[PDB]
Amino acid sequence: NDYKYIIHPKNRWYKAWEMFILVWAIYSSLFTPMEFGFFRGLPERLFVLDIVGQIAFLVDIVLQFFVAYRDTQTYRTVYKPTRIAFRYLKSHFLMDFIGCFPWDLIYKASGKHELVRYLLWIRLFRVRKVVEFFQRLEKDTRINYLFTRILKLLFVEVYCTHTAACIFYYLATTLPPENEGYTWIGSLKLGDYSYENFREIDLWKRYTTALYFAIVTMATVGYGDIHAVNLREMIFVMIYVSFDMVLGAYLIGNITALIVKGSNTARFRAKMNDLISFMNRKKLGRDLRSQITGHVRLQYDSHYTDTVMLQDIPASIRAKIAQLL
Amino acid sequence: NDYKYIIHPKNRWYKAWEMFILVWAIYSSLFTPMEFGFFRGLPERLFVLDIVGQIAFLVDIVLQFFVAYRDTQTYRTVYKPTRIAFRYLKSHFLMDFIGCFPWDLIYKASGKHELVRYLLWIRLFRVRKVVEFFQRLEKDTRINYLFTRILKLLFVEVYCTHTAACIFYYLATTLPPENEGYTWIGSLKLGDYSYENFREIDLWKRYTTALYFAIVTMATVGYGDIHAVNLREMIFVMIYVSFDMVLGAYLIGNITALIVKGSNTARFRAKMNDLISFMNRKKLGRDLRSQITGHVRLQYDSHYTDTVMLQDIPASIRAKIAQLL
Amino acid sequence: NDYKYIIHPKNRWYKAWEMFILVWAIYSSLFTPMEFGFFRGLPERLFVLDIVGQIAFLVDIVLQFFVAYRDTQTYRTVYKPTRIAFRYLKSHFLMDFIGCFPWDLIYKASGKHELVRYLLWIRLFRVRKVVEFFQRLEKDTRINYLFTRILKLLFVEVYCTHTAACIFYYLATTLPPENEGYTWIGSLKLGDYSYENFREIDLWKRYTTALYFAIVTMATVGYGDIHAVNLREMIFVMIYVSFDMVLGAYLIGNITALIVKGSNTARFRAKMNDLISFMNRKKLGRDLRSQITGHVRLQYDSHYTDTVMLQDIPASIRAKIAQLL
Amino acid sequence: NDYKYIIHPKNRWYKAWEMFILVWAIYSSLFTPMEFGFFRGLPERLFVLDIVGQIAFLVDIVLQFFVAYRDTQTYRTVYKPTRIAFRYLKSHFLMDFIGCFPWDLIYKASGKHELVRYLLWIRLFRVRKVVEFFQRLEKDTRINYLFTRILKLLFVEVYCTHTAACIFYYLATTLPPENEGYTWIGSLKLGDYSYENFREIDLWKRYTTALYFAIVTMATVGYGDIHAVNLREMIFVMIYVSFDMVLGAYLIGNITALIVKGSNTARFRAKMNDLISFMNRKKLGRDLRSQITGHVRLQYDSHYTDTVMLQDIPASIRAKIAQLL
Ligand SMILES: [K+]
Ligand SMILES: [K+]
Ligand SMILES: [K+]
Ligand SMILES: [K+]
């Protein structure tokens, strides 16, 4: 607590930086698969756009040597640079530094070898920012929990869908441009339009045609106007739909598990059903029918605070409600 | 209270009008996407229908200024007729007033501008009166609290495919009639029948083809004889099936939460399942291997009568059954 | 009772009759859509089969004034041959009586009017037997409940898509043979085999093609080799893929609800693994660990057999339990 | 005890053997449908592989007479090697010895009789070792037994589609090679590769094509470039997707119960959501929220998982903890 070259992690200049690299760790998570797939090296008018975005991430390298890490079991904020600067190199230092090398200038420098461009798939470790942003959005008791817990599983299931549409076009560009009729896009004809010589089509027609055959597959609709033709594309859509089957079952299971043990206000309307169904099975004279649901509304609005709340309560809370009521 | 200018909210001469406005709001929210998508301005018939579809809502928009409101906080009836007109002008006035302007004559008497027809979507706020019909049916006690959340959810799921079937046809008409072979309907050939010059086919063939696509996409069957061809129909199908993927898991999540607290055909087969871990684990007489299982057949729906709901609730009903026997 | 002109409801020679018309109730409710759709009047080789099948449902309509029942109030046997004839004649008499008429040649001996062959669709009220067989099986503890709850929903779901496969070919026979190219089967070509002049095709090829369509629609696969061509087949599959969309979300719901309320072994696994979960946060003794997991290895069965059903055993039944123990 | 012949069942040299035939019970389970579907007798290259794979199961069938079994009602490890003759010959002996003969050599030199090769399916009883591997992984308390039924039901859901992928190719070869255009592969054309004369394509192209069909059917995607054309392939696809529907519902039903049974951050929001409902009715201090919500992690798992899991435990460890303090 006596260092002062140390930011404790709720500053109004650090919370306004932590959300500044979340519109870069979203952009560099989306531009990275369609930088790998749709471009064999970036064009020259993106030279200014790709040198930034990596210039705002090595600012983040030096700036996380100075933030106060709150420990797990110690439950106190640690303030010494010796204790944060070693957990940084232990946990996340290679992930965020080897991705900050310019891999578009290296690829054009090395005689255009193809395998050096696979070292920009390590920029997909910047999805940590978005999943952490969704992670302490569950720990915010203001927003509907069923709204956020399904937005985390609808960020993942569409980001994986976006990535397995750039890989699916990359597997079409790996064949030469004379075995071009033996691929999923070079043999495509939609309406009165033919996708011949698909390296010259506009980027967004190629990207939309690729993403349509990942969202139609992800939703398990599968029209079959676009389908796999090669053998590597068959293997890729075997790997993809097998993982997407589990990813889709772990959304029904994640919605059901929040509806089943859902709102107790729905359970009150549920638990008056058997009351009415046994007062009206063997008919009782119509006397209390509204006063009972009013009294049980006032009861179950206080039944959780009758016994159930205050076995877990600490001292110096309940006496206030006890004196005020 | 001391007012005469207002109407009691449980009048059976007012709730015989809320059923009339219900079957007007059901009609003019199904026809409204059919007026948007399938017509560029209504024909010379359906004009008197277009004006009597709105002078049935003008009567309701002048009637709700004189209805009694039950307060949200104090749970009291608010009779005085300026705390309701201040309330009605704030919550529902301007999306119900601008849905009663004649947006077909305003379109045709303005030089036929296309963008003024997009104000025909504010008439889709009249599904308020259909979704509240399902909300005051849940708070009914006569039928299930969740079956009116299954018949409600199947209304919402099917209504969004009637709307998507009209937007999907509308996107085919935004292309010029000479480039019709690059659409989903202009390049269609189902059987020996070619769907060319598709603005001169009968209206019901066009609507049935579009609804056939939207419904076999909603159920995620997706045969593929009708698919997206443009880059705008690709984007629309990509938007639609993602929202449909979340709307189709909510149905399953509600049906599970209905079933998990059902009847004794799944509880009794846990009761005798736990009995047979004492009635067959510790060996028991075959004479008594009929007696208690016949008894636990005889208690549920007859002698059980949900005893805890007559245990925790006070004993005026017990005084009534003391008067019984 | 002193009547003796009534068969008792439980019997040796009567329960071997109800599982003899149970074979005729799974025959004559599976041959009935195949006789409506694929035939227009049975041929002469199938004459004696449609006569002997309807007299077995005629010696059974007279064998219901000779049987007792169990009313839900007295819950005893009600031997009186005039009470039963005013309950049988109310509920099950018309639907069980006019389905025994010889509808095959009543069609043939009335000038072959097609609308009189729609009155053999009420021979599908014979599936009362095949559903009371499955709702009798669920009150039987010889077999597990997870097998007789997912097979009642696999009888229903396969039977409805057997019916929707004969209706789907019937809608192709309602066009003339000069417009057979505008149907789903006359405009079919699977491989190098073309289904031209489909009335002159062997019955089982037509039935297998139609049922293969309806089964790959039921599972929501939907290949698209067989699709709806007309405007009346689109309407049928629009009804059908939206009915079985709820019928197949009701099956997932049952399989889920019969898993989340697991047996004793599942709760045993759960509570012992969450017992060992908090063990290695303190890391106590090794023989202590094994000894207390032995304590809760024998503290699952008789400890939680005993405490559960002692909440409900009636009087004079616990007494000989305590006497034997 | 006195017997020195037999292996003690928790040997260290019998846990490097049952993990040695678990890659021969995965090899001989994946290769046997590929030996049955894709060949007519093995080539003379693949000879010593078959012989080694069969001899390292003979060496196991004479090694399980030499072992003791844990009793399940007496719970003693039975060392007596005269009752190991029993519990093996009314157990897996004939389905370890009949499926151990050289069934390719019997087929190749007896006359090329096709029905002899159907006895290779006895070798699919060696999946019992792989399914008993997971059933010995359920009992490991150091891993969640609900996330050992998500890969157990995913091996089952992907082994049954590797097998179906070979039966689907086998039904294409039961037709003569001149009537190959009436198959699913002899009438296939993908891009510009016509799959004609399909017995001379190399093995991995045929296997990748058949597994591609079976896996996009298993996920219920179903593009429809590869569909059934025959009547045998139609009946097989009908049988396969009906099993697959129940298995896919069973996967969701098993995933759901994993999420319903507790989640700690979700349980923090299972309590905070109703705790604030009381607080906005009986309005406490707005500056007392920090006192309330801070202790909903302070005694979660520091008093919730500690003593509430311990009221079924004696205080012999509580004395150790109290002297620890
Ligand atoms: K499909
Ligand atoms: K398809
Ligand atoms: K599907
Ligand atoms: K599908």
Side-chain angles (χ1 to χ4, degrees):
Chain A
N1 53 49
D2 53 355
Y3 302 90
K4 293 294 116 183
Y5 289 165
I6 287 300
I7 312 167
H8 59 280
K10 57 182 180 291
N11 199 327
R12 311 212 69 181
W13 275 262
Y14 183 66
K15 285 282 163 304
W17 172 257
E18 190 268 356
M19 197 174 168
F20 181 69
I21 42 171
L22 189 79
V23 312
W24 290 104
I26 274 173
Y27 155 76
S28 177
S29 275
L30 270 71
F31 186 51
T32 294
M34 63 182 297
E35 149 174 357
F36 182 71
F38 296 90
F39 299 107
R40 290 279 170 87
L42 276 75
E44 203 87 358
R45 75 202 208 105
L46 287 197
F47 190 87
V48 65
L49 175 59
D50 82 308
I51 194 65
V52 301
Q54 316 307 298
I55 206 66
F57 258 113
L58 82 161
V59 175
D60 183 53
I61 293 297
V62 290
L63 192 144
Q64 300 191 195
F65 285 117
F66 296 145
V67 298
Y69 150 74
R70 191 198 76 87
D71 208 332
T72 55
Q73 53 91 33
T74 321
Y75 64 87
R76 265 83 166 272
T77 317
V78 189
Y79 277 69
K80 198 173 193 293
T82 175
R83 281 194 57 92
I84 45 181
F86 275 71
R87 87 167 303 263
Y88 190 64
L89 275 72
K90 176 60 185 177
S91 297
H92 310 278
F93 184 57
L94 274 75
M95 288 175 189
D96 287 342
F97 184 67
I98 317 296
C100 279
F101 282 173
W103 300 110
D104 183 74
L105 287 189
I106 291 175
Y107 162 71
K108 297 160 180 162
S110 295
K112 287 186 183 178
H113 279 81
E114 170 62 34
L115 195 144
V116 81
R117 277 172 67 239
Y118 283 71
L119 296 181
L120 59 88
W121 277 105
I122 58 175
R123 304 172 158 167
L124 298 208
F125 293 99
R126 306 172 167 186
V127 189
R128 297 174 309 149
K129 275 82 170 178
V130 195
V131 305
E132 201 285 328
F133 157 71
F134 280 115
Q135 182 181 355
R136 66 184 182 277
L137 207 71
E138 312 287 316
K139 295 180 182 297
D140 189 343
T141 59
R142 198 263 315 262
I143 308 100
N144 297 317
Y145 193 77
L146 193 146
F147 170 66
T148 77
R149 182 71 251 190
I150 75 171
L151 276 196
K152 186 192 164 59
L153 266 298
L154 285 165
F155 161 72
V156 172
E157 197 181 3
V158 198
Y159 185 63
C160 296
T161 296
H162 158 58
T163 318
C166 317
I167 310 170
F168 200 63
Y169 174 82
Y170 174 62
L171 299 181
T173 45
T174 54
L175 276 78
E178 73 256 9
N179 308 322
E180 185 261 333
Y182 193 29
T183 190
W184 69 271
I185 185 164
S187 70
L188 191 53
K189 179 149 191 288
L190 278 193
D192 62 337
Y193 180 68
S194 179
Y195 281 70
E196 282 156 349
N197 307 117
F198 70 98
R199 282 91 190 278
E200 277 78 17
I201 304 180
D202 208 323
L203 162 71
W204 296 105
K205 197 179 279 282
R206 293 192 256 117
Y207 177 66
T208 307
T209 312
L211 188 63
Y212 168 80
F213 190 57
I215 299 185
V216 157
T217 291
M218 165 257 280
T220 66
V221 188
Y223 297 122
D225 42 357
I226 308 177
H227 53 78
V229 169
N230 266 312
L231 220 70
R232 49 190 95 171
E233 301 154 28
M234 282 176 195
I235 292 170
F236 183 71
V237 307
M238 288 174 227
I239 292 165
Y240 175 52
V241 309
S242 298
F243 163 77
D244 202 71
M245 196 183 55
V246 186
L247 214 51
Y250 196 68
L251 183 74
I252 312 175
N254 220 355
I255 279 174
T256 294
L258 296 172
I259 291 175
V260 163
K261 56 180 290 184
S263 296
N264 218 340
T265 77
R267 275 183 170 89
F268 164 68
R269 277 92 166 96
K271 73 182 180 67
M272 277 168 311
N273 286 102
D274 53 357
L275 188 149
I276 303 300
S277 179
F278 97 103
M279 302 219 304
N280 264 322
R281 178 200 328 171
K282 184 56 188 170
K283 168 245 179 176
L284 194 147
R286 270 86 182 186
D287 49 359
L288 273 164
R289 304 313 187 112
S290 179
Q291 289 180 356
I292 42 170
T293 193
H295 184 269
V296 170
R297 207 154 297 109
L298 293 176
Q299 263 194 318
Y300 204 71
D301 278 337
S302 178
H303 270 294
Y304 52 92
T305 46
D306 196 1
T307 176
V308 195
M309 187 273 291
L310 71 161
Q311 288 93 20
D312 293 331
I313 195 167
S316 176
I317 296 98
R318 202 47 206 171
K320 297 291 288 184
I321 305 100
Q323 64 91 28
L324 196 145
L325 170 82
Chain B
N1 299 12
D2 55 354
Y3 317 98
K4 193 45 184 291
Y5 276 142
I6 74 162
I7 296 171
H8 293 62
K10 270 75 176 175
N11 186 10
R12 45 184 292 250
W13 270 354
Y14 183 64
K15 300 202 308 303
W17 160 259
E18 284 199 343
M19 185 72 207
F20 191 75
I21 210 62
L22 169 66
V23 285
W24 271 107
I26 275 167
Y27 160 73
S28 162
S29 59
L30 294 177
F31 182 53
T32 310
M34 287 198 50
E35 188 198 349
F36 185 80
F38 288 87
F39 303 108
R40 300 264 168 157
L42 271 189
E44 312 289 351
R45 55 172 295 198
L46 301 144
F47 151 76
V48 292
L49 183 49
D50 191 274
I51 190 64
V52 307
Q54 312 311 304
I55 65 168
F57 269 94
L58 210 49
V59 187
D60 194 297
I61 201 168
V62 309
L63 187 47
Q64 198 91 350
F65 273 137
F66 313 114
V67 73
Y69 156 61
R70 176 90 162 200
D71 183 82
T72 61
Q73 293 298 108
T74 81
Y75 318 126
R76 301 191 57 239
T77 75
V78 190
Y79 268 44
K80 185 256 289 181
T82 198
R83 276 195 44 186
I84 52 170
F86 177 54
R87 185 208 166 228
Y88 182 76
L89 275 191
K90 179 63 72 175
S91 63
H92 302 158
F93 173 70
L94 192 59
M95 71 192 193
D96 207 351
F97 196 45
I98 322 291
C100 192
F101 279 10
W103 288 116
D104 178 52
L105 317 163
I106 280 172
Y107 160 70
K108 267 174 303 203
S110 190
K112 276 167 143 284
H113 270 90
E114 174 54 49
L115 192 144
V116 77
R117 286 173 72 250
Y118 276 66
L119 282 150
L120 280 185
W121 288 103
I122 306 303
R123 296 189 162 157
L124 264 76
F125 285 98
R126 307 169 169 193
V127 201
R128 265 186 297 124
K129 303 180 183 78
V130 189
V131 73
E132 291 305 316
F133 166 66
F134 283 106
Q135 197 180 333
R136 285 169 285 191
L137 208 77
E138 298 207 307
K139 293 186 283 186
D140 180 26
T141 43
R142 163 182 68 255
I143 205 64
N144 270 313
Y145 175 60
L146 295 98
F147 188 82
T148 67
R149 221 158 54 192
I150 283 147
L151 191 64
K152 172 178 186 314
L153 271 173
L154 201 71
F155 154 74
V156 178
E157 209 176 18
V158 172
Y159 177 63
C160 298
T161 70
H162 159 72
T163 306
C166 299
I167 305 173
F168 196 63
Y169 175 80
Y170 170 65
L171 293 167
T173 52
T174 57
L175 270 74
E178 60 267 356
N179 296 137
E180 71 169 359
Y182 193 41
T183 41
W184 68 268
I185 178 156
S187 51
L188 191 44
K189 181 168 183 82
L190 271 177
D192 67 336
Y193 184 62
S194 180
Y195 275 76
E196 68 184 2
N197 283 255
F198 70 98
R199 296 149 153 110
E200 299 157 1
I201 327 178
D202 289 345
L203 163 73
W204 291 108
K205 187 169 266 280
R206 299 188 256 142
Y207 180 68
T208 308
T209 306
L211 198 58
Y212 165 78
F213 170 75
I215 283 184
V216 310
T217 294
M218 168 208 65
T220 68
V221 174
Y223 290 112
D225 51 353
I226 298 166
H227 52 251
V229 176
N230 275 307
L231 287 187
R232 52 186 96 205
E233 316 162 6
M234 274 173 186
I235 293 172
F236 176 67
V237 171
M238 273 152 49
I239 293 165
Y240 169 52
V241 308
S242 296
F243 162 77
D244 166 59
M245 195 188 54
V246 193
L247 208 52
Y250 209 84
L251 176 72
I252 304 175
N254 273 93
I255 289 183
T256 63
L258 164 81
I259 292 178
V260 293
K261 308 167 289 321
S263 170
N264 41 55
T265 194
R267 320 180 304 224
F268 157 71
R269 295 213 64 170
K271 297 290 105 174
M272 191 173 175
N273 195 2
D274 206 50
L275 261 65
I276 212 161
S277 313
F278 178 73
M279 146 176 171
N280 269 25
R281 169 156 63 87
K282 295 213 192 253
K283 187 175 175 65
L284 189 146
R286 191 89 72 193
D287 191 300
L288 310 98
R289 269 167 176 161
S290 299
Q291 193 177 10
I292 195 62
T293 179
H295 265 313
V296 306
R297 283 193 185 197
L298 283 173
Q299 281 104 30
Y300 305 125
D301 83 1
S302 50
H303 287 171
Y304 170 54
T305 323
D306 216 292
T307 314
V308 176
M309 294 303 289
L310 58 95
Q311 286 293 320
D312 191 283
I313 306 296
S316 180
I317 308 300
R318 293 182 183 174
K320 171 75 74 174
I321 201 165
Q323 297 304 314
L324 263 291
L325 291 176
Chain C
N1 204 0
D2 293 331
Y3 280 2
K4 189 54 69 179
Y5 298 93
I6 289 171
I7 308 299
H8 293 243
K10 270 74 69 178
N11 200 296
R12 171 154 70 254
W13 270 29
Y14 171 71
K15 286 197 172 315
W17 170 255
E18 188 171 29
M19 203 175 286
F20 177 68
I21 55 157
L22 204 71
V23 177
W24 289 107
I26 76 164
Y27 162 70
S28 190
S29 69
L30 289 186
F31 187 52
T32 297
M34 292 197 57
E35 193 214 319
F36 177 75
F38 296 90
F39 294 107
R40 294 213 155 144
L42 286 170
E44 46 92 24
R45 101 182 174 269
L46 279 166
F47 172 63
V48 71
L49 182 51
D50 207 70
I51 302 300
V52 78
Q54 311 308 304
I55 187 154
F57 282 102
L58 182 59
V59 309
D60 193 86
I61 190 167
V62 306
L63 203 143
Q64 297 266 304
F65 321 98
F66 306 143
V67 69
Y69 71 102
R70 199 85 94 207
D71 70 281
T72 195
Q73 284 83 10
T74 297
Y75 275 130
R76 294 183 73 200
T77 304
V78 200
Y79 304 107
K80 186 53 183 73
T82 170
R83 296 275 302 272
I84 49 176
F86 265 90
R87 161 183 150 268
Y88 186 69
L89 262 75
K90 278 316 171 213
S91 297
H92 295 333
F93 188 67
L94 281 192
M95 46 194 277
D96 204 6
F97 174 61
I98 43 171
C100 298
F101 276 4
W103 293 113
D104 165 64
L105 69 152
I106 280 182
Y107 173 82
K108 291 158 173 169
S110 44
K112 289 168 70 65
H113 275 83
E114 173 64 22
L115 182 139
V116 79
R117 219 191 62 217
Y118 281 73
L119 275 78
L120 62 89
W121 271 108
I122 61 178
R123 294 180 151 161
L124 295 207
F125 289 102
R126 293 163 165 175
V127 293
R128 301 180 314 270
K129 322 288 206 318
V130 198
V131 77
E132 278 138 12
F133 164 68
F134 274 123
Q135 279 177 349
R136 268 200 278 102
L137 188 63
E138 294 174 352
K139 271 82 184 177
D140 175 42
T141 52
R142 303 185 207 168
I143 194 184
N144 54 325
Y145 187 47
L146 201 64
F147 202 61
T148 79
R149 205 47 179 90
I150 79 174
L151 256 68
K152 195 214 174 298
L153 302 160
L154 278 172
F155 163 67
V156 163
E157 207 176 338
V158 179
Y159 180 59
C160 301
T161 72
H162 162 69
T163 311
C166 312
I167 296 174
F168 197 65
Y169 174 85
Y170 175 63
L171 297 179
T173 47
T174 61
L175 291 204
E178 286 84 15
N179 310 329
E180 85 176 340
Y182 198 34
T183 58
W184 69 269
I185 181 158
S187 88
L188 197 54
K189 178 165 192 175
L190 274 187
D192 59 338
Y193 182 76
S194 184
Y195 281 73
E196 200 204 356
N197 319 324
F198 64 95
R199 283 86 181 272
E200 267 65 45
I201 288 185
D202 194 25
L203 171 68
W204 294 105
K205 192 183 264 278
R206 292 188 258 126
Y207 175 65
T208 316
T209 311
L211 181 59
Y212 157 74
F213 170 76
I215 284 280
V216 308
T217 297
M218 177 191 77
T220 69
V221 190
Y223 291 121
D225 44 355
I226 308 171
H227 48 81
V229 168
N230 269 316
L231 217 75
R232 63 184 81 166
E233 307 155 20
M234 285 174 189
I235 291 179
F236 178 68
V237 301
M238 270 189 262
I239 289 165
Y240 164 56
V241 309
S242 60
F243 160 70
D244 83 322
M245 189 189 55
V246 201
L247 210 62
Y250 195 74
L251 164 77
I252 301 178
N254 267 268
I255 297 179
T256 293
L258 271 68
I259 287 297
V260 299
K261 299 205 166 169
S263 180
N264 315 337
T265 306
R267 300 180 177 183
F268 181 45
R269 295 281 88 82
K271 292 189 292 185
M272 198 182 282
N273 63 43
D274 307 305
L275 175 145
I276 204 169
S277 296
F278 87 108
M279 185 62 72
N280 294 112
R281 289 139 36 87
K282 275 83 56 171
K283 191 66 177 66
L284 299 155
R286 180 75 45 168
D287 311 328
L288 185 146
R289 205 183 337 260
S290 295
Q291 185 254 331
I292 197 65
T293 54
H295 170 233
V296 303
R297 247 193 286 107
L298 273 76
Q299 201 251 323
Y300 78 109
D301 48 357
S302 179
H303 303 248
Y304 294 144
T305 317
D306 203 4
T307 47
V308 179
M309 86 280 288
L310 277 177
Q311 303 162 355
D312 191 296
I313 302 110
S316 296
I317 309 298
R318 295 182 185 177
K320 195 172 183 179
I321 285 290
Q323 184 260 324
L324 293 195
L325 294 175
Chain D
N1 42 357
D2 50 316
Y3 296 94
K4 300 286 102 176
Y5 288 125
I6 64 163
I7 303 298
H8 212 73
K10 266 70 69 176
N11 199 315
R12 205 187 45 80
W13 272 46
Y14 197 62
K15 297 293 178 68
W17 177 254
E18 63 95 20
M19 310 276 288
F20 178 70
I21 307 188
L22 195 144
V23 301
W24 289 106
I26 286 173
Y27 161 74
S28 69
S29 301
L30 299 174
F31 181 57
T32 286
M34 305 194 53
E35 189 189 351
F36 175 77
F38 288 85
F39 293 110
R40 300 283 193 189
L42 286 172
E44 288 185 352
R45 178 183 179 271
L46 294 170
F47 182 72
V48 301
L49 186 46
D50 184 278
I51 299 308
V52 177
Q54 293 334 283
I55 192 167
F57 273 95
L58 187 70
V59 76
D60 199 89
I61 66 167
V62 285
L63 197 137
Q64 293 212 354
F65 287 166
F66 283 60
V67 82
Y69 61 94
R70 179 59 170 180
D71 214 323
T72 175
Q73 67 272 17
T74 304
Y75 298 90
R76 58 177 68 246
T77 69
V78 188
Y79 310 106
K80 291 190 287 291
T82 72
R83 228 173 67 175
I84 319 293
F86 310 127
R87 208 203 154 259
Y88 205 83
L89 273 84
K90 202 45 195 171
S91 160
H92 315 267
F93 177 74
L94 317 174
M95 53 187 287
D96 278 330
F97 180 66
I98 303 300
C100 190
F101 295 149
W103 287 118
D104 186 88
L105 269 298
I106 306 177
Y107 160 70
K108 279 227 282 182
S110 163
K112 308 271 191 181
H113 269 81
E114 165 57 50
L115 193 145
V116 192
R117 286 174 58 244
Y118 279 74
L119 294 172
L120 305 160
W121 291 105
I122 319 293
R123 306 188 180 191
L124 255 75
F125 289 133
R126 310 165 170 193
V127 181
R128 148 195 75 242
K129 306 206 172 68
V130 192
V131 75
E132 215 167 355
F133 166 69
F134 291 99
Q135 198 175 4
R136 279 194 331 269
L137 208 59
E138 297 291 328
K139 276 78 177 175
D140 286 330
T141 48
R142 70 174 162 199
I143 190 61
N144 45 359
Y145 89 109
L146 287 170
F147 193 59
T148 317
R149 305 178 180 185
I150 309 302
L151 254 65
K152 182 201 172 216
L153 296 179
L154 200 153
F155 172 74
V156 162
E157 212 180 354
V158 83
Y159 184 71
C160 292
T161 70
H162 162 63
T163 302
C166 313
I167 306 179
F168 200 65
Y169 175 83
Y170 179 52
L171 301 164
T173 58
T174 58
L175 273 161
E178 57 267 7
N179 302 151
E180 74 189 326
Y182 197 36
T183 47
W184 66 271
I185 185 176
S187 87
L188 184 48
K189 183 177 178 74
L190 284 195
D192 54 357
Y193 188 60
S194 64
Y195 281 72
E196 62 197 36
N197 303 314
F198 68 96
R199 294 161 165 90
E200 316 160 349
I201 313 170
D202 73 314
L203 194 79
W204 295 108
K205 181 149 263 170
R206 300 182 259 136
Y207 177 69
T208 317
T209 310
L211 196 68
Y212 162 70
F213 166 75
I215 283 182
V216 308
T217 301
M218 163 205 93
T220 71
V221 179
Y223 296 131
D225 50 352
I226 299 170
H227 55 259
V229 160
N230 267 309
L231 290 180
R232 38 189 87 166
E233 292 149 44
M234 271 182 210
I235 297 166
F236 178 67
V237 166
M238 280 195 254
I239 285 155
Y240 167 54
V241 306
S242 298
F243 165 81
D244 197 49
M245 193 181 53
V246 180
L247 190 47
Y250 200 56
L251 186 83
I252 305 168
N254 273 92
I255 285 189
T256 298
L258 161 67
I259 317 160
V260 160
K261 194 186 77 179
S263 292
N264 304 286
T265 290
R267 266 168 301 207
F268 153 74
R269 277 281 271 275
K271 299 294 289 184
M272 189 62 71
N273 55 3
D274 187 36
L275 186 58
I276 61 171
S277 176
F278 188 62
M279 190 176 178
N280 211 340
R281 195 160 50 232
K282 309 281 191 183
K283 185 67 179 68
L284 271 299
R286 200 255 186 192
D287 307 308
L288 275 74
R289 267 160 175 161
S290 298
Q291 177 193 208
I292 296 169
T293 190
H295 287 292
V296 195
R297 192 34 63 181
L298 193 137
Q299 65 255 29
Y300 281 184
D301 298 331
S302 179
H303 288 115
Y304 158 71
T305 314
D306 285 333
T307 186
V308 191
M309 306 296 113
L310 191 145
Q311 299 111 2
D312 268 318
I313 306 299
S316 65
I317 65 168
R318 199 258 301 163
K320 307 189 189 73
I321 291 301
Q323 273 69 245
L324 178 139
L325 288 176

